[PDB]
Amino acid sequence: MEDFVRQCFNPMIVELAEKAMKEYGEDPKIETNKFAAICTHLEVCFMYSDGGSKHRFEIIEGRDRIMAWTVVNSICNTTGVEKPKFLPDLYDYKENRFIEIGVTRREVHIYYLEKANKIKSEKTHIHIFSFTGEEMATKADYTLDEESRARIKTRLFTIRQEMASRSLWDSFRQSERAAAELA
Ligand SMILES: CC(C)(Oc1ccc(Cl)cc1)C(=O)N1CCC[C@@H]1c1nc(C(=O)O)c(O)c(=O)[nH]1
Ligand SMILES: [Mn+2]
Ligand SMILES: [Mn+2]
Secondary structure (H helix, E strand, O other): OHHHHHHHOOHHHHHHHHHHHHHOOOOOOOOHHHHHHHHHHHHHHHHHHHOOOOOOEEEOOOOOHHHHHHHHHHHHHHHOOOOOOOOOOEEEOOOOEEEEEEEEOOOHHHHHHHHHHHHOOOOOEEEEEEOOOOEEEHHHOOOOOHHHHHHHHHHHHHHHHHHHHOOOHHHHHHHHHHHHHOO
């Protein structure tokens, strides 16, 4: 699994994921499912910004959380957008709204419901992707054009298939449920 992560992911995404887990006291060599899940979520955030113009998105995910709040503050002060209660993943400069990106191995609408209750902000856009080519966005507003989201779904389906060929998928899918159960 650790071998798969460094094989399928850009080494900068890998280092970002390693840097993130170390700052939270987690070993990437042990919590291998979370390692792959952080890499996958980070890649989707990068592929999401590619779907718009070079003026379109500000990527908040993958940066130092303390510094990421200063940019959130600068955006809210400049644009007048209400400040979110949790750090989002992107800011949309065109629609002038923050975006939460979800990547789940569970069902998309159940995952949306959990994010919507936890975010509990309104005006923070939610877009969920699954490894089964499904997606769900707030009020059916998918933000990106069809070709941009197709690239994301295909990439996630690709990751699933190659995990499935290494017998790693079923452990990856069950880990999110295990993380959800412990409460
Ligand atoms: C998506 C991911 C990696 O799933 C897993 C999967 C398996 C395991 Cl063992 C642990 C987590 C996660 O880290 N999750 C699941 C929901 C909570 C958290 C999350 N955090 C942020 C953030 O910004 O901190 C997000 O932006 C966000 O989309 N998800
Ligand atoms: Mn995030
Ligand atoms: Mn997210």
